[PDB]
Amino acid sequence: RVGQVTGLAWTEVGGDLLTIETACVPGKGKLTYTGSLGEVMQESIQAALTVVRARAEKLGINPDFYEKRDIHVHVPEGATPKDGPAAGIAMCTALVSCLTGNPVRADVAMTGEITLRGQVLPIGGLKEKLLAAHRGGIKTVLIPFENKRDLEEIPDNVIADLDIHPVKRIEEVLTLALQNEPSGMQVVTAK
Amino acid sequence: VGQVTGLAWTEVGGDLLTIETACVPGKGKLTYTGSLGEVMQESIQAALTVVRARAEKLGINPDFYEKRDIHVHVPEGATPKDGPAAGIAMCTALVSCLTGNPVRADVAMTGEITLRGQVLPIGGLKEKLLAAHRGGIKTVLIPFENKRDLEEIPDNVIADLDIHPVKRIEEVLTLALQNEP
Amino acid sequence: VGQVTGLAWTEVGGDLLTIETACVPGKGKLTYTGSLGEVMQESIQAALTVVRARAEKLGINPDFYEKRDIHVHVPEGATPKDGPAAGIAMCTALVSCLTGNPVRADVAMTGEITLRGQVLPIGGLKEKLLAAHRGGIKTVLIPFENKRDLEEIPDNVIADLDIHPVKRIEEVLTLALQ
Amino acid sequence: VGQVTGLAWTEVGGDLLTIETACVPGKGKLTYTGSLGEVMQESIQAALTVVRARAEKLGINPDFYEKRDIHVHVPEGATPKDGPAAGIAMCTALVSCLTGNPVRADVAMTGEITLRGQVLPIGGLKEKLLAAHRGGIKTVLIPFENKRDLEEIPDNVIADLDIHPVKRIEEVLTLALQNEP
Amino acid sequence: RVGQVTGLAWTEVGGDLLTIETACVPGKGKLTYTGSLGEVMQESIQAALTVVRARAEKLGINPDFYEKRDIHVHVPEGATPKDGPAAGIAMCTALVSCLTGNPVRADVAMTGEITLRGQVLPIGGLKEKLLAAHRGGIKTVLIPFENKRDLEEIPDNVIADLDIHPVKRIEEVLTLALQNEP
Amino acid sequence: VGQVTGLAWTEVGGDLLTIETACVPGKGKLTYTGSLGEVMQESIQAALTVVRARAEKLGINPDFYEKRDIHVHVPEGATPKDGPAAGIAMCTALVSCLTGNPVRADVAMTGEITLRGQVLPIGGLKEKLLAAHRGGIKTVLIPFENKRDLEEIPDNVIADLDIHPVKRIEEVLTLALQ
DSSP states (O other), rough: OOOOOEEOOOEEEEEOOOEEEEEESSSSSSSESSSBOOHHHEEEEEHHHHHHHTTHHHHOOOHHHHTTEEEEEEEESSSSSSEESSSSSHHHHHHHHHHOOOOSSEEEEEOEETTSSBBOOOSSOOHHHHHHHTTOOOEEEEGGGGGGGGGGGSHHHHHSSSEEESSSHHHHHHHHHBBSSSOOOOOOOOO | OOEEEEEEEHHHHHEEEEEEEEESSSSSSEESSSSSSHHHHHHHHHHHHHHHTTTTOOOOOOOOGTTTTEEOOOSSSSOOOOTTTOOOOOHHEEEHHTOOOOBTEEEEEOOOOOOOBBBBBOOOOOHHHHHHTTTSSSSSEEEEEGGGGGGGSSSSHHHHHHEEEBBBBBHHHHHBBOOOO | OOOEEOOOOOOOOOOOOEEEEEESSOOOOOEEESSSSSHHHHHHHHHHHHHHHHHHHTTTTTTTSSEEEEEEEOOSSSBBBBBSTHHHHHHHHHHHHHHHOOOTEEEEEEOOOOOOOOOOOSHOOOOHHHHHTTTSSSSEEEEEEGGGGGGGSSSSHHHOOEEEEESSSHHHHHHHOO | OEEEEEEEEEEEEEEEEEEEEEEEEEESSSESSSSSSSSHHHHHHHHHHHHHHHHHGTOTTTGGGGGGEEEEOOSSSTSSEETTTTHHHHHHHHHHHTOOOOOOOEEEOOOOOOOBBBBOOOOOOHHHHHHHTTTTTEEEEGGGGGGGGGGSSSSHHHOEEEEEEEEHHHHHHHBBSSSSO | OEEEEEEEEEEEEEEEEEEEEEEEOOOOOOOOEEEEBBBHHHHHHHHHHHHHHHTTTTOOOTTTTTGGGGEEEESTTTTEEESTTTTTHHHHHHHHHHHTTTOTTTTTTOOOOEEETBBBBBBSSSHHHHHHHHHTOOOOEEEEEEGGGGGSSSSSHHHHSEEEEESOOOOHHHHHHHHHHH | OOOOEEEEOTOOOOOOEEEEEEEESSSSSSEEEBBOHHHHHHHHHHHHHHHHHHTTGGTOOOOOOHHEEEEEEEEEETTTTTTTHHHHHHHEEEEEEOOOBOOOEEEEEEEEOOOTTBBEESOHHHHHHHHHHTOSSSSEEGGGGGGGGGGSSHHHHHOEEEEEEEBBHHHHHHHHHH
């Protein structure tokens, strides 16, 4: 479950469900991405990686470990075309995981366009993506805050089933999706 | 920091762009993303050269581009964008990212940049300001030579805007950045 | 070096292919050839990444790829080929190439591989097993989730062939490697 | 940043162009932008090699291109440009940039450059010279072999112009650079 | 430094005699290939070089030869489009010849698709290829073992003039084509 | 030095070409410009390999490949040029810029070069010789197998030219360099 995230984004078989895989192996700092990915989705991976790279210290990733590793983002089924910016936060979560050996919580799906500032941006086809996550057995679905309005025409059943967390920042997403806390050392205070 | 509100052409017309820049440990790679057309990609290259040429004067380490990677990104990722009007915005975002000097988030800017750092006039001035106005921008930087073009835009819109016509990049920086580079 | 009988889509002729891998002194380059469409090219990258993530368990020096170049080739050279169905063959071949452990010549295999090492189901099982049968292959490895598809394969083909439905790459390698 | 007024082909037709060059710290990289077609791109390369081969004679550090990058840019970024007619401007701009010898602003120039530093004739001289004239250019450098082409250009335009027919890049540099190289 | 082998392979105007040239000069490990070559034929050159690299030790070649050499494979005539895999064993032979200083027999031609494991695969258009061999005065032609069936279709007089050697593997090709023992 | 007159196909017709070369302080980059078609670009790569394979004997430091950048440019820049006919000129220009050995004036040459250094026959010899004539060329080097094509060339053109049928690159360097 390390480096495996369920994203909701566009496929040629509809705004279906994505299984995103990442690997971090010995190398020289090369990035590879595969899975019949359109250009917009490829650019989203680049944006997600950069988000990771800038937040490195805070994520505990040494830049001088990152440079002796190669990264491969892969999205099966490999023959099915996928595109759009909606897996950006899925991409970023998967990248953080594979770089940190921090397993991704299961029954968790996410959709959202990522920015370099760590802001999660509204996406399209919320309904379809959630029909997708429903027929998938996913409980927790992370969606962008500005998509909250779009919920009103999602069947209560779907809503009652899905533990839905609207999210504004990448910071919340990682905490919701990762086993351990990705950011900052645990400091315990008592009153 | 590393964020600038620019005004440029998008598939649906002149609009607000949030230009993002990040600067991380690397070996001199620049990446630019956001469904950018080729003319816009080139303005990014010109803006970076402006920053590189004026590097030492701006506080920046003139050897920065051999040890760091730069990503310029313009959301939203799927919306096509093009033209050279983001140029001074590109430059300001780069300076900001490389110095850590916050950008005033009440300021939008539009204009083509040259390697000499002069601000060239742009097209579709009406759409850009109408966009800036609807988005609640308080202060807008426009090319000096677009001054004439203001009179074709609703007075009620111009009256709401603090408009600074500019000739040179050093003016843009001083007006948009928080501190004094 | 590495050779595995894969079953995968081709524009012409049989869907039965020999996946070949070579590992030679180099600087860490990857080369893949054989009139490969883009999906099949990506499946090579996936397969390699699988092996690289398990080099230790597989008994391969984790930093092997530093001083080594890899060439993956899929004859016949001029026959257009594509699709992900050669994934597990490519992975098996690469392991064979890097360990020196030979692959059984009476075994064919077909399946799409994931980075996690799972074996995904493929299309055209019938045409694939016919190529395998016509080609004299004794044992055929197929995705577990293609189990239901066997229902529509000729009983003689079913009678003549030893079919092992598989789920993960560990099974493939155990069955295929000598 | 070296600036030279070139006359060269654009999508609107032969026109006055500002050629910009920047030499900044780098590792020998060449960048060229400004919606340039391939033939113009190749002229930049020919131009640079001319300078590179004549480095010491021009008083340039012969290994300058080892620790430095070059960006040649021709605004306006959006207007397509092509053809070889900016070659001598490119070469002049690079020489100006690498030596700090500022270019005269009363001078425009047009002509194809070769590696041996010969200036070859170009087409559309009429359009080019009318463009220099409308833009208030006093002095225009043209290839020696374009001399006869002057006769089909209105006399009233040519009488206003100080025209210098040139054969070699050394002539170009002497006439166009402020200080004697 | 320049290996030379006669291959029989496909050109725009049909299967033909090709002179395959290979150069190994002071370099850093680059591979260059030219001669209006289509992609399949470009791929056969990469396959043929890989065969040599994998077998360098057995060929008496320093296994690190490529780290300090550049290779250029060129197939004249420059303007004639050529494609397909039939020049593969010729490419391998030229590369081995060049790298080991083992000259190539001049009356020999060869056609055959090479594989990384070094097996020679059958090609098409044997008759067209063999006649070009015959016209060009070639005495010896190496052909793939599985092309034996196609010999029945070749005019009897061409069969009688040509010394035809059906080969299964690259070692046979090299033994038959190189002046010295591989 | 580094300037050779070649005869090769252009979009305006088989024409006279001024091949230019410069060898500059650098790191081993090859640049070739002049709106050159791929076949003509490939002839440049072939010509360079010939020089590289013979560097020592040509009094060229064999490590020039690593310490110098070479730019091959064929004006006029906007005129498309293609085909293999400039090969021997390319080789000659290259030897010249690397050796400082000047190229004779009033020499033009046409011919496809091979890596072994053989000169191969070209097409359009007649349009090529007519071009050499009007450009005021005295001596013209042609491939040996193009001798037969001389029997289509006007009497005066032939009378005016000193034509040398050549088999090999070393006759070329001999007849063309000082």
